[PDB]
Enzyme design. Structure first.
Site, PDB file in Angstrom:
ATOM      1  N   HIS A 261       0.815  -1.207   0.000  1.00  0.00           N
ATOM      2  CA  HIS A 261       0.000   0.000   0.000  1.00  0.00           C
ATOM      3  C   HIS A 261       0.850   1.259   0.000  1.00  0.00           C
ATOM      4  O   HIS A 261       0.372   2.311  -0.438  1.00  0.00           O
ATOM      5  CB  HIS A 261      -0.943   0.001   1.201  1.00  0.00           C
ATOM      6  CG  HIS A 261      -2.007  -1.048   1.127  1.00  0.00           C
ATOM      7  ND1 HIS A 261      -2.801  -1.382   2.202  1.00  0.00           N
ATOM      8  CD2 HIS A 261      -2.405  -1.842   0.105  1.00  0.00           C
ATOM      9  CE1 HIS A 261      -3.643  -2.335   1.846  1.00  0.00           C
ATOM     10  NE2 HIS A 261      -3.423  -2.632   0.578  1.00  0.00           N
TER      11      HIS A 261
ATOM     12  N   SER B  20      -0.233  -1.163  -6.222  1.00  0.00           N
ATOM     13  CA  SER B  20      -0.214  -2.489  -6.822  1.00  0.00           C
ATOM     14  C   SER B  20      -0.098  -2.402  -8.339  1.00  0.00           C
ATOM     15  O   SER B  20      -0.378  -1.371  -8.953  1.00  0.00           O
ATOM     16  CB  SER B  20      -1.459  -3.293  -6.435  1.00  0.00           C
ATOM     17  OG  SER B  20      -2.584  -2.884  -7.178  1.00  0.00           O
TER      18      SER B  20
ATOM     19  N   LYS C 245     -15.426  -9.188  -6.041  1.00  0.00           N
ATOM     20  CA  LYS C 245     -14.584 -10.082  -6.830  1.00  0.00           C
ATOM     21  C   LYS C 245     -13.796 -11.044  -5.944  1.00  0.00           C
ATOM     22  O   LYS C 245     -13.726 -12.245  -6.238  1.00  0.00           O
ATOM     23  CB  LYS C 245     -13.647  -9.271  -7.720  1.00  0.00           C
ATOM     24  CG  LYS C 245     -13.111 -10.046  -8.907  1.00  0.00           C
ATOM     25  CD  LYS C 245     -12.365  -9.141  -9.866  1.00  0.00           C
ATOM     26  CE  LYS C 245     -11.704  -9.943 -10.972  1.00  0.00           C
ATOM     27  NZ  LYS C 245     -10.852  -9.090 -11.841  1.00  0.00           N
ATOM     28  N   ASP C 246     -13.213 -10.552  -4.844  1.00  0.00           N
ATOM     29  CA  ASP C 246     -12.556 -11.469  -3.923  1.00  0.00           C
ATOM     30  C   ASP C 246     -13.541 -12.337  -3.153  1.00  0.00           C
ATOM     31  O   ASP C 246     -13.180 -13.454  -2.803  1.00  0.00           O
ATOM     32  CB  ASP C 246     -11.610 -10.751  -2.951  1.00  0.00           C
ATOM     33  CG  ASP C 246     -10.460 -10.037  -3.653  1.00  0.00           C
ATOM     34  OD1 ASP C 246     -10.333  -8.803  -3.557  1.00  0.00           O
ATOM     35  OD2 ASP C 246      -9.662 -10.733  -4.314  1.00  0.00           O
TER      36      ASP C 246
ATOM     37  N   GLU D  47       5.599 -34.147   1.442  1.00  0.00           N
ATOM     38  CA  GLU D  47       4.375 -33.828   0.723  1.00  0.00           C
ATOM     39  C   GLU D  47       4.684 -33.163  -0.617  1.00  0.00           C
ATOM     40  O   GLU D  47       5.831 -32.828  -0.931  1.00  0.00           O
ATOM     41  CB  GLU D  47       3.461 -32.947   1.572  1.00  0.00           C
ATOM     42  CG  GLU D  47       2.917 -33.652   2.799  1.00  0.00           C
ATOM     43  CD  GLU D  47       1.963 -34.782   2.428  1.00  0.00           C
ATOM     44  OE1 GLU D  47       1.267 -34.669   1.396  1.00  0.00           O
ATOM     45  OE2 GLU D  47       1.921 -35.796   3.150  1.00  0.00           O
TER      46      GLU D  47
HETATM   47  C1  HEM Z   1       1.827 -15.674   3.233  1.00  0.00           C
HETATM   48  C2  HEM Z   1       1.193 -15.644   2.068  1.00  0.00           C
HETATM   49  C3  HEM Z   1       0.975 -14.363   1.377  1.00  0.00           C
HETATM   50  C4  HEM Z   1      -0.028 -13.484   1.625  1.00  0.00           C
HETATM   51  C5  HEM Z   1      -1.119 -13.617   2.656  1.00  0.00           C
HETATM   52  C6  HEM Z   1       0.140 -12.404   0.733  1.00  0.00           C
HETATM   53  C7  HEM Z   1      -0.761 -11.343   0.745  1.00  0.00           C
HETATM   54  C8  HEM Z   1      -0.815 -10.466  -0.311  1.00  0.00           C
HETATM   55  C9  HEM Z   1      -1.851  -9.560  -0.578  1.00  0.00           C
HETATM   56  C10 HEM Z   1      -3.112  -9.393   0.230  1.00  0.00           C
HETATM   57  C11 HEM Z   1      -1.514  -8.874  -1.699  1.00  0.00           C
HETATM   58  C12 HEM Z   1      -2.346  -7.795  -2.343  1.00  0.00           C
HETATM   59  C13 HEM Z   1      -3.402  -8.378  -3.291  1.00  0.00           C
HETATM   60  C14 HEM Z   1      -2.767  -8.995  -4.507  1.00  0.00           C
HETATM   61  O1  HEM Z   1      -2.214  -8.295  -5.320  1.00  0.00           O
HETATM   62  O2  HEM Z   1      -2.818 -10.322  -4.692  1.00  0.00           O
HETATM   63  C15 HEM Z   1      -0.256  -9.346  -2.135  1.00  0.00           C
HETATM   64  C16 HEM Z   1       0.414  -8.868  -3.242  1.00  0.00           C
HETATM   65  C17 HEM Z   1       1.742  -9.183  -3.527  1.00  0.00           C
HETATM   66  N1  HEM Z   1       2.489 -10.126  -2.947  1.00  0.00           N
HETATM   67 FE1  HEM Z   1       1.868 -11.331  -1.475  1.00  0.00          FE
HETATM   68  N2  HEM Z   1       1.215 -12.598  -0.048  1.00  0.00           N
HETATM   69  C18 HEM Z   1       1.775 -13.774   0.278  1.00  0.00           C
HETATM   70  C19 HEM Z   1       2.890 -14.395  -0.279  1.00  0.00           C
HETATM   71  C20 HEM Z   1       3.741 -13.707  -1.124  1.00  0.00           C
HETATM   72  C21 HEM Z   1       4.980 -14.164  -1.555  1.00  0.00           C
HETATM   73  C22 HEM Z   1       5.563 -15.492  -1.165  1.00  0.00           C
HETATM   74  C23 HEM Z   1       5.516 -13.192  -2.384  1.00  0.00           C
HETATM   75  C24 HEM Z   1       6.829 -13.215  -3.054  1.00  0.00           C
HETATM   76  C25 HEM Z   1       7.113 -14.042  -4.047  1.00  0.00           C
HETATM   77  C26 HEM Z   1       4.571 -12.132  -2.454  1.00  0.00           C
HETATM   78  C27 HEM Z   1       4.762 -10.979  -3.184  1.00  0.00           C
HETATM   79  C28 HEM Z   1       3.697 -10.139  -3.497  1.00  0.00           C
HETATM   80  C29 HEM Z   1       3.762  -9.111  -4.531  1.00  0.00           C
HETATM   81  C30 HEM Z   1       4.956  -8.796  -5.387  1.00  0.00           C
HETATM   82  C31 HEM Z   1       2.554  -8.516  -4.558  1.00  0.00           C
HETATM   83  C32 HEM Z   1       2.154  -7.385  -5.468  1.00  0.00           C
HETATM   84  C33 HEM Z   1       1.203  -7.863  -6.558  1.00  0.00           C
HETATM   85  C34 HEM Z   1       1.148  -6.875  -7.684  1.00  0.00           C
HETATM   86  O3  HEM Z   1       0.877  -5.588  -7.436  1.00  0.00           O
HETATM   87  O4  HEM Z   1       1.347  -7.256  -8.810  1.00  0.00           O
HETATM   88  N3  HEM Z   1       3.491 -12.485  -1.676  1.00  0.00           N
HETATM   89  N4  HEM Z   1       0.152 -10.326  -1.262  1.00  0.00           N
END
Ligand code: HEM
Ligand SMILES: CCCCCCCCCCCCCCCCCC(=O)OC[C@H](COP(=O)([O-])OCC(O)COP(=O)([O-])OC[C@@H](COC(=O)CCCCCCCCCCCCCCCCC)OC(=O)CCCCCCCCCCCCCCCCC)OC(=O)CCCCCCCCCCCCCCCCC
Ligand SMILES: CCCCCCCCCCCCCCCCCC(=O)OC[C@H](COP(=O)([O-])OCC[N+](C)(C)C)OC(=O)CCCCCCCCCCCCCCCCC
Ligand SMILES: CCCCCCCCCCCCCCCCCC(=O)OC[C@H](COP(=O)(O)OCCN)OC(=O)CCCCCCCCCCCCCCCCC
Ligand SMILES: CCCCCCCCCCCCCCCCCC(=O)OC[C@H](COP(=O)(O)OCCN)OC(=O)CCCCCCCCCCCCCCCCC
Ligand code: HEM
Lengths: 101, 51, 380, 446, 89
Positions: free
Chosen positions: C201, C205, C227-228, C271
């Site tokens: 934020h 995004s 949507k979510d 697993e």
């Molecule tokens: C523990 C599990 C995870 C949760 C709960 C989580 C949660 C979120 C949420 C709520 C968002 C914003 C909504 C979305 O764009 O999908 C997001 C975006 C993002 N997350 Fe995660 N995330 C997780 C794992 C990861 C991992 C492992 C990575 C790294 C590889 C990552 C990198 C990102 C990135 C780069 C975005 C930006 C998406 C964009 O603007 O294109 N996340 N995440």
């Protein structure tokens, strides 16, 4: 040569940003130099660029493309941002050289 | 990484070698003290009495 | 005056994060997945809490408590199988979230990417020790195998493994401390997810075109709210059909036997979400090299923002790197298949070529392809 | 052609002679048709003892209002008659009475200066008029914020010493001093061995020496009770004065540390350090391409309205530091960046910025020594402080011996882990208190 | 009611707005409505029928929105349409 030019037109069609009406310089990732060159643009090209970006985002939002007569043809893809980008890049190299010495 | 290849950056690196080496000495001494490493504390004379 | 949603200090945080947050209009269903992860995390916590109400972390009664949950507790089988299949669903959503971040150039949000990599490490450790917790045959033997690979570390590895074990092997102390750590790590995962959302934020995004979406942005409510919720409902459809119709298609049968240190299984696997890392480690004919191969596989996933040598962000207009990306996903599928196979011909050479191609595609071929694309598009 | 070295060595030397009273007579000859002749006296607010705190200032007001030989405005009619200009100033250590005139009017000017130093008739009605004048000019001087801030800095840095008290003195002393206090100050601090007759421009040294023998011989030479005053060292105190007044539009903050003094040569090195930091105000046309990192970050972040660096030197003491003017909501950031620059000069000085500072110091010295008035001013201060006129070739030698290693050594000697004196005036609530500034006076990474 | 009474009586002042009102009245209503009839129709209005008429013409209705200028912070049509009703009622 001519074969390379034809293959480059084929790759331009395969890239697919012409189907959204975008130019070549619209698809550049906004780094610091790119944002400075965008800020150096005249207001007509600036407004044209951001309307094209808004229309491309709207078309991607509804998962559609433009009609084929409205596609950005290869020979009318003018590189508007390129001389401003060259100016910004060259002055950043000059500042980098001065800080380096 | 050709941005930092110049005489000014070499002078800055040369100036910051002894501080970084002293901090590395601090880190090595702290690691030996915290882990109670026998490869070094068996050589320091006053520390030998606790083993 | 009465605009409490933007004046109340608690309510303005929820407002700024979920109601008046400017989101790109054109983000696809892939952007749902991270939100699903948070919901899935909550599901895991809730099911785990009820699974913590009847489970004992004692080696003489852990299996007995699991059978008592599945047989005597009212809908305890439902809670246990929702927990296990929700772990599987969590790793599915993690893989698709990471794949979205790799494809659409979202790794340029570097702090968000690094906090994600830490989150992925924490979730993998939590799921490993949680799988150790039911104290079946495969739990004990997988814990023994993974701790021996940890003991491959020179000069400090053996003492560290007997410190983690609390003794000479996997035993009572290992199971009890694994229950404690498996309880405590998802709350740290939730806090790291709060940090994840804070950094995202801060930076905004991304969209599938990879362009500046400031010209066309919409409020998060009610568009991405509904949507979510549609995505959560689809994910609950898949989770509940996996629980109520095929409860054992992802699990392993030998975990339904009690742990026997005298008897070893003929083939020991983790697993399915650890199988690609198991195949990467198992391909190199060395111990320390294999452990470093696993750690550096997840570390080059972390190192990905430094390998971007293209003037475009997303892969929407980059077909050669699209082909390389789908070859990489295909190679990950091959590695997941090889990780569940024993070491005979030709699985060793297939896994070796798969791991070599994986590291070559990530480290070498993608920046070279991006440079070729920049030449072909007449950028420089 | 000629390079910088022989261009500096082609400057004519300042020749100094001495009368039988101990009065120094120094001159430097140029090709100009004008000249500047002044008298420099080693007498300021540091020699006052809190009972006569405005005696030098009030005598500086009374010194042009008539003498015994030239009663009243007829005196200034004379300095109108040749078209000459008459100026005087007073600092904490020196007092100067100088005349800019033509060369051919050299004798009478010297005679005029003689009256100004030894025949000033202090009329009581003139004392009342100048008392009202001094009261109203303090009433306009407290509107100028930088004078208030530098007086506050002197007071809080030299608490309990005669260097804290201002040149003007308090208003109660202005309402209180009489003619006898002025007479005692005049008979105590206007001694001939503490006086320099300096001349610059189209003057001959032998003619000026003959005129000083004719007019300026036998001033006092004797303290009349064998009661010789002695200069006392002043204790520096790391301290803070905060004058909060939120109605002012801008805030002025000065931060200083203890300086070395006049006779300590590393002053030159410290001057080079000031040339690295430099000065800035809002009308500078450099933009973001200014060489000073503090000025560049101030332009980039819109932080300050102005800043400057100072090296004020007194007899084996001084104030070395920076004064900046900015709005309230920037103050702390400015302090942070300023302290960072000082620590960079203590830790990470490179040869290029040292070369730039040396070039800036060379330009500053030679461009300041231009015209008869600043040359005469430099001659008077050099004979009062160093006891000799340091030539520009010696300054160039002391500049070129400065390198980066001794600059960061001297800066670590004078800036690193030192207790500063802080003086703030204006909306200074976001100005950090003494622990934060003192912690910013060092780095945890060295 | 007092504001509306003062507004219409103050508007009917001078020959030009009276002739203007006569022209619109015979074009629209087919007759010139006397001002005492307007006062009777004003005085028959109370809070209950004001609530009823405002609910019939305002509550849960789809509006028409026109915006010009820096209207980036002008909310979406969905947010405005949600603001055209109350969840507490
Ligand atoms: C523990 C599990 C995870 C949760 C709960 C989580 C949660 C979120 C949420 C709520 C968002 C914003 C909504 C979305 O764009 O999908 C997001 C975006 C993002 N997350 Fe995660 N995330 C997780 C794992 C990861 C991992 C492992 C990575 C790294 C590889 C990552 C990198 C990102 C990135 C780069 C975005 C930006 C998406 C964009 O603007 O294109 N996340 N995440
Ligand atoms: C021949 C093939 C079918 C053709 C067809 O029906 O085309 C119609 C239509 C054509 O779409 P379109 O008009 O070109 O543009 C799409 C719309 O603009 C917008 O439609 P949309 O597809 O973007 O809708 C939002 C999206 C939102 O997606 C989500 O919420 C899903 C998020 C991911 C969940 C993953 C769960 C875990 C997965 C583990 C593996 O929903 C879906 O992707 C599927 C929704 C299905 C609802 C239930 C239908 C019964 O197909 C769809 O909309 C696709 C879904 C069809 C069902
Ligand atoms: C709790 C008491 C200490 C609180 C912190 C503190 O005052 O630190 C002192 C100071 C900060 O307090 P300070 O403000 O007094 O710092 C003064 C610093 N000098 C003297 C250089 C001007 O911290 C340090 O210097 C670093 C402390 C850690 C040193 C490295 C680790 C040692 C053990 C390795 C294993
Ligand atoms: C998945 C099956 C195939 C889905 C599909 O059809 O993908 C095509 C889609 C095209 O998207 P795009 O190129 O943006 O074009 C939009 C123009 N209409 O392209 C995409 O949707 C690309 C994004 C797919 C992301 C998920 C696929 C990879 C999943 C595994 C990733 C593993 C990462 C590493 C993990 C271990 C470390
Ligand atoms: C040349 C055109 C295609 C062939 C002829 C068909 C022409 C049909 C014409 C009609 C129109 C069809 C629709 C067109 C849509 C857009 C264009 C398109 O799809 O192009 C073809 C596509 C991408 O082509 P492009 O990326 O532009 O080529 C780069 C070469 N300079 O894709 C290709 O070019 C093909 C890519 C094939 C990749 C094969 C990879 C094989 C290896 C996979 C290994 C995976 C596992 C690895 C394991 C390792 C360890 C064991
Ligand atoms: C703090 C919240 C959590 C608690 C209290 C908790 C508690 C438990 C307990 C008591 C068990 C043993 C019961 C059983 O075998 O089904 C278990 C199993 C398990 N947990 Fe968790 N858990 C939590 C969160 C998670 C998370 C976030 C994951 C990862 C997605 C996870 C993955 C697993 C796995 C894979 C098993 C083994 C399932 C099986 O084989 O039966 N748990 N958990």
């Amino acid at each position: 040569s001519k074969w390379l030019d034809g293959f480059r037109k084929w790759y331009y069609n395969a890239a697919g940003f012409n189907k959204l009406g975008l130019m070549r310089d619209d698809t550049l990732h906004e780094t610091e130099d790119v944002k400075e060159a965008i800020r150096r643009l005249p207001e007509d090209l600036y407004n044209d660029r951001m309307f094209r970006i808004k229309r491309a985002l709207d078309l991607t939002m509804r998962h559609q493309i433009l009609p084929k007569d409205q596609w950005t043809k290869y020979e009318e893809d003018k590189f508007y941002l390129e001389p401003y980008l060259k100016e910004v890049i060259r002055e950043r190299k000059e500042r980098e050289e001065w800080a380096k010495k | 990484l050709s941005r930092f290849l110049g005489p000014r950056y070499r002078e800055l690196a040369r100036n910051w070698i002894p501080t970084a080496g002293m901090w590395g000495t601090v880190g090595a001494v702290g690691l030996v003290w915290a882990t109670d490493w026998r490869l070094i504390l068996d050589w320091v004379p006053y520390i030998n009495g606790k083993f | 005056m009465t605009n409490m949603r933007k004046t109340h200090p608690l309510f303005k945080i929820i407002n700024h994060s979920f109601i008046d947050l400017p989101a790109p209009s054109n983000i696809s269903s892939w952007w749902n997945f991270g939100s699903l992860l948070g919901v899935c995390l909550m599901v895991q916590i809730i099911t785990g809490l009820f699974l913590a109400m009847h489970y004992t972390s004692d080696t003489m009664t852990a299996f007995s408590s699991v059978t008592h949950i599945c047989r005597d507790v009212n809908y305890g089988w439902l809670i246990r199988y929702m927990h296990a299949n929700g772990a599987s669903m969590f790793f599915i959503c993690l893989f698709l979230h990471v794949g979205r971040g790799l494809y659409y150039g979202s790794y340029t949000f570097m702090e968000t990417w690094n906090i994600g990599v830490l989150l992925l490490f924490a979730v993998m450790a939590t799921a490993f020790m949680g799988y150790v917790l039911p104290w079946g045959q495969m739990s004990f033997w997988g814990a023994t195998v993974i701790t021996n690979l940890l003991s491959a570390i020179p000069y400090i590895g053996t003492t560290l493994v007997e410190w983690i074990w609390g003794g000479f092997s996997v035993d009572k102390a290992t199971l009890t401390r694994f229950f404690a750590f498996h309880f405590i790590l998802p709350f740290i995962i939730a806090a790291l997810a709060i940090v994840h959302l804070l950094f995202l934020h801060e930076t905004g995004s991304n969209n599938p075109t990879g362009l500046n979406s400031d010209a066309d942005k919409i409020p998060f409510h009610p568009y991405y709210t509904i949507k979510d919720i549609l995505g959560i409902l689809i994910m609950f459809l898949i989770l509940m059909t996996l629980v109520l119709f095929f409860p054992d298609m992802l699990g392993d049968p030998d975990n339904y036997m009690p742990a026997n240190p005298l008897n070893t299984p003929p083939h020991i696997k983790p697993e399915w979400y650890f199988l690609f890392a198991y195949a990467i480690l198992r391909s190199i004919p060395n111990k320390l090299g294999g452990v470093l191969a696993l750690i550096l596989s997840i570390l080059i996933l972390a190192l990905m923002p430094f390998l971007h040598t293209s003037k475009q962000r997303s892969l929407m207009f980059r077909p050669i790197t699209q082909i390389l990306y789908w070859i990489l996903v295909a190679n990950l599928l091959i590695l997941t298949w090889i990780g569940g196979q024993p070491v005979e011909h030709p699985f060793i050479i297939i896994g070796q070529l798969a791991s070599i191609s994986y590291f070559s595609i990530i480290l070498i071929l993608m920046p070279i392809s991006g440079i070729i694309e920049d030449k072909m598009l007449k950028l420089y | 052609t000629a390079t910088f070295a022989q261009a500096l060595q082609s400057v004519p030397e300042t020749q100094v002679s001495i009368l039988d009273n101990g009065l120094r007579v120094a001159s430097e000859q140029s090709s100009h048709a004008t000249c500047t002749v002044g008298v420099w006296i080693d007498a300021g607010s540091r020699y006052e003892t809190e009972k006569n705190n405005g005696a030098g200032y009030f005598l500086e007001h009374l010194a042009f209002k008539g003498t015994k030989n030239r009663p009243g405005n007829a005196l200034e009619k004379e300095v109108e008659s040749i078209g000459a200009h008459l100026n005087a100033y007073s600092t904490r250590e020196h007092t100067a009475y100088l005349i800019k005139a033509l060369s051919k009017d050299l004798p009478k000017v010297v005679e005029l200066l003689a009256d100004i130093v030894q025949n000033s008739s202090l009329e009581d009605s003139q004392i009342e008029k100048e008392r009202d004048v001094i009261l109203r000019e303090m009433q306009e001087n407290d509107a100028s914020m930088q004078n208030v801030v530098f007086d506050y800095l002197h007071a809080t840095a030299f608490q309990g010493t005669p260097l804290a008290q201002a040149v003007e003195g308090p208003s109660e002393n202005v309402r209180r001093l009489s003619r006898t206090d002025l007479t005692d100050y005049l008979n105590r601090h206007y001694k001939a061995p503490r006086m320099v007759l300096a001349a610059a421009g189209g003057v001959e040294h032998q003619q000026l020496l003959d005129l000083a023998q004719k007019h300026l011989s036998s001033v006092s030479r004797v303290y009349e009770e064998d009661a010789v005053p002695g200069l006392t060292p002043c204790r520096f105190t790391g301290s803070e004065i905060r004058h909060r007044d939120d109605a002012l539009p801008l805030a002025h903050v000065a931060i200083a540390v203890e300086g070395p003094g006049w006779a300590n040569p590393d002053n030159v090195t410290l001057q080079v350090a000031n040339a690295i930091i430099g000065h800035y105000d809002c009308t500078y046309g450099g933009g973001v391409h200014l060489s000073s990192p503090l000025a560049s970050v101030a332009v980039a972040n819109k932080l300050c309205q102005s800043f400057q660096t100072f090296n004020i030197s007194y007899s084996d003491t001084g104030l070395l530091g920076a004064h900046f003017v900015c709005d309230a909501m920037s103050i702390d950031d400015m302090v942070f960046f300023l302290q960072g620059q000082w620590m960079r000069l203590c830790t990470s000085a490179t040869e290029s910025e040292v070369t730039r500072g040396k070039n800036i110091l060379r330009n500053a010295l030679v461009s300041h020594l231009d015209g008869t008035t600043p040359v005469c001013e430099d001659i008077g201060r050099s004979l009062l402080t160093y006891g000799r006129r340091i030539p520009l070739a010696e300054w160039e030698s002391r500049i070129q011996e400065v390198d980066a290693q001794m600059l960061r050594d001297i800066c670590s000697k004078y800036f690193y882990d030192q207790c500063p004196a802080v003086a703030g005036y204006g909306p200074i609530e976001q100005l950090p208190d003494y622990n934060r500034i003192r912690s910013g006076m060092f780095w945890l990474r060295f």
